[PDB]
DNA sequence: CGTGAGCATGCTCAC
DNA sequence: GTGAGCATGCTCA
């Protein structure tokens, strides 16, 4: 997807280095099913207030981009609910007592959207921890497909502030799997 | 809970191997999902009227035993249904006009019972089609645990007659997976 | 119909 | 827990 940094300069940064790691050359996140990955939110601006963070996912794959991405059969019954997430939420956000899970009732994706908090003090970003409830290999959901993982600033009134994104593989080797597609990587 | 002839020497036969395939030194069957599996039914003397063959599920290993073996969530879901099997049933009866999907209220095991029919003429067994619904490695299913198939002849009462078994991996690829398990069988020393 | 090599990807098991 | 290697479904010459 396309990026819009907007008006108070919004986009992501990663933690450096598994369960959870982020390559550059491929901007893509390789994560463990379940396991916390902390997403740095970066302004250039303060947000006006009530401003709020969304997240979602969506195939990367043209022909697969209006397919909702959802939990597959298994883990959607497999009984490991926090109580606020609905069972077929794929991202589900840890750390924050305000998210909110909601599905679009025109497209029906699913999305998860948090309060946008100033930095703390010392810090020049504030951090949102995301869990993948499905790897990218589960059958009846995501199916092996890649999906993009959306993330936008909107104002209290749902308007896009700013939007940034990056592409994410959950499965059980991160480091062997980002090692394997950064080599088979070809540019130009 | 054993293998058993009877009073009729009941037991199964295999025609020899992939899609399916039967390995005597394991008594194990490799078949891939869905494909229709031939066993044959084999007895000395003909049984009584309204004798029932009656297949059933199990995991071989002890610490699984009391688990129930079923369609993974996926397949469960996937509408490949015929119309008259549960979709949560993994065995399914192919070719025979009046199958009948129990489900022991008790156990909450499946089984799939389908009427004893005697050889046809200038043949000594008689054949019954079964496939699966399932891979052995099913995420949410069998999950990769191996499971026996108890495949037994009881009569109109319910009563059993006679019992065999055999173990079943259904997968991807029968004939290298079967070479494997033979290979690693072998080592028995 | 019918072949086979290599790989994708969750799992298991020594050090 | 850390790297090695296996188990097992899929892709495609
Ligand atoms: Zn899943
Ligand atoms: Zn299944």
Same mark, same amino acid.
């Given at each position: 997807q396309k990026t819009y940094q907007g008006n108070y300069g919004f986009h992501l940064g990663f933690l450096q280095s598994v369960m959870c790691t982020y390559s550059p050359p491929l901007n893509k996140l390789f994560c463990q099913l379940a396991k916390t990955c902390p997403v740095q939110l970066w302004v250039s601006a303060t947000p006006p207030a009530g401003s709020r963070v969304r997240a979602m996912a969506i195939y990367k794959k043209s022909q697969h981009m209006t397919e909702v991405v959802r939990r597959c059969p298994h883990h959607e019954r497999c $009984? %490991?609910? %926090?109580?606020?997430? /609905? /069972?077929?939420?794929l991202i589900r956000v840890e750390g924050n007592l305000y998210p909110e899970y909601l599905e679009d009732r025109q497209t029906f994706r699913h999305s998860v959207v948090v309060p946008y908090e100033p930095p703390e003090a010392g810090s020049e970003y504030t951090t949102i921890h995301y869990k993948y409830? =499905?790897? +990218? $290999? =589960?059958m009846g959901g995501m199916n092996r497909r890649p999906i993009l993982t959306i993330i936008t600033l909107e104002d $209290? +009134?749902?308007?896009?502030?700013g939007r940034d994104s990056f592409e994410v593989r959950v499965c059980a080797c991160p480091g062997r799997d980002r090692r394997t597609e950064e080599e088979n990587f070809r540019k130009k």
């Open positions: $009984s %490991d609910g %926090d109580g606020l997430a /609905p /069972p077929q939420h409830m =499905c790897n +990218s $290999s =589960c $209290s +009134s749902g308007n896009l502030l």
